[PDB]
């Protein structure tokens, strides 16, 4: 069954991803255009069949909790690999979204970062470490008021040993990263999750150069609450060992009373 | 101090 027939093909959305419908029902898709040239990892499927460990990832995680955009379909063509993927509308990144409204109320933060962190909890659940969790790989569906994580292609299957490899963005590595060359994906993963509340809270990144990565000091521009500033610090402890559990962070007083995705919609996105 | 999009 050709690619040409079963979707319609719009215009550009980034990159090389174009929005898209599927005939079939009128679904809105994203169509994601990956060059064979450019994968480093390739994973195998049951098939056999030899693919990039994007469509390894994002099958494990397709599952249907609605935390993570969904993989509906794949095709390999000579040079290129096209993934259809589900699209929301209306939908904003979470980058576009800190940039227009600034720093965030913590009462929205804390819905925010609350399903960041549960969409996380199913990719490890299901064997996924994401590596490149930022602002700019969050979808927020507008009207839902649910969060989607993207963009996998830096991703790897979940080991409990060490890491060596790193294709993800550098500000939101941990600085065992910056200093050995070396990480574990969990201790890494809530790393970049205290970068990313920070951004939330503070309306940017805390981090831009090495020096501050290691350098164990987080200076708050933005009033914001102890508890907040407590659980941040706390996920950007400087040794791997001294950060909190995915089950510490969700019990930490600051994540108390989430709103619900519709109550997060009708109060702040509508 | 300016807000901006980082490479992966
Ligand atoms: N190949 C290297 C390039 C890596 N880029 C990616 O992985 C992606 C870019 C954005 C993706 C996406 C996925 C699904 C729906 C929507 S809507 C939307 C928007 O910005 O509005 C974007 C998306 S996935």
Redesign the interface.
Known sequence: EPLESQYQVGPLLGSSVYSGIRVSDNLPVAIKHVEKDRISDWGELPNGTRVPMEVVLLKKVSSGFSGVIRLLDWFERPDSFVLILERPEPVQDL?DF??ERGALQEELARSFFWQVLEAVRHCHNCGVLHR?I?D?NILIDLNRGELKLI?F??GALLKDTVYTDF??????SPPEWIRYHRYHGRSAAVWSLGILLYDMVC??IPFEHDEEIIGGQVFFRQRVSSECQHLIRWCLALRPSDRPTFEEIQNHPWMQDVLLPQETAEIHLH | ?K?R????
């Open positions: 980058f800190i940039t490149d930022k700019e963009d292609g830096s294709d993800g963005t550098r500000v939101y309306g940017d | 101090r807000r999009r980082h490479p992966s």
